[PDB]
């Protein structure tokens, strides 16, 4: 049966801050061989691009096999030693496939305070 064609990106956030904060970005693309997710900090900076020991850490899962009707890539963003800068920083995950990039972004402060 023809697999159904989904393209999605989503972030799972913690409802409260801790000393280690992990953000789970998960992708969903039917482009099984050509889809992946990753984080951009603020406006245009991949984690690689950051000053060393800045508190951000990216974990991109690999060897992660695609399922039958989609690839489901994942990239966790990891915050230690949190500064208010980081608390108000715009954090964005991107889905990249042979289609126009999909983004979901978030500001932690706004969430921890949306209560």
């Amino acid at each position: 049966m023809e697999c159904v064609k989904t393209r999605s990106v989503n972030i799972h956030v913690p409802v409260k801050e801790t000393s280690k904060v992990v953000l789970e970005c998960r992708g969903d693309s039917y482009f099984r061989h050509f889809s992946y997710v990753y984080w951009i900090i603020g406006k245009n900076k991949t984690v690689d691009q950051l000053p060393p020991n800045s508190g951000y850490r990216e974990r991109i899962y690999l060897f992660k096999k695609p399922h039958r009707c989609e690839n489901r890539p994942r990239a966790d963003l990891i915050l230690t030693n949190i500064t208010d800068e980081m608390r108000n920083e715009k954090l964005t995950c991107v889905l990249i496939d042979p289609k126009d990039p999909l983004k979901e972004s978030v500001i932690l402060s706004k969430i921890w305070n949306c209560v």
Partner: protein, 141 residues
Amino acid sequence: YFGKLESKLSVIRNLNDQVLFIDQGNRPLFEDTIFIISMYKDSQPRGMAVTISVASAAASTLSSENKIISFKEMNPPDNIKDTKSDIIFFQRSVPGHDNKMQFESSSYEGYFLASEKERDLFKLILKKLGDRSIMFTVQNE
């Protein structure tokens, strides 16, 4: 910024199903063989940044330098510190035809990989709606 990620053994064909390949003179051509598409992450996301290299023992990497098609003796690099590169192409799907791909140059916007006949030769070239000559299929494992 371009960050190298995952890489795929790939066979590329034009819309007449001619297989892309390299002869002994390092000419990219189409006949009736195996390449490595490497995906990169982008600080300024505009599509799927990829490199095209020959799955050889050799170092061979497709380049759109000076608006011509070449193979630079080099491997796709771990990172590129620029917004564009002569070896980086955006791999985008043909609208309405998700099984079809186009390859726009990053350094020369509006320019795409294309299959062109010559005299008795189908050669891969660089070229400035619906042009089937800039459409390809990519096959994977």
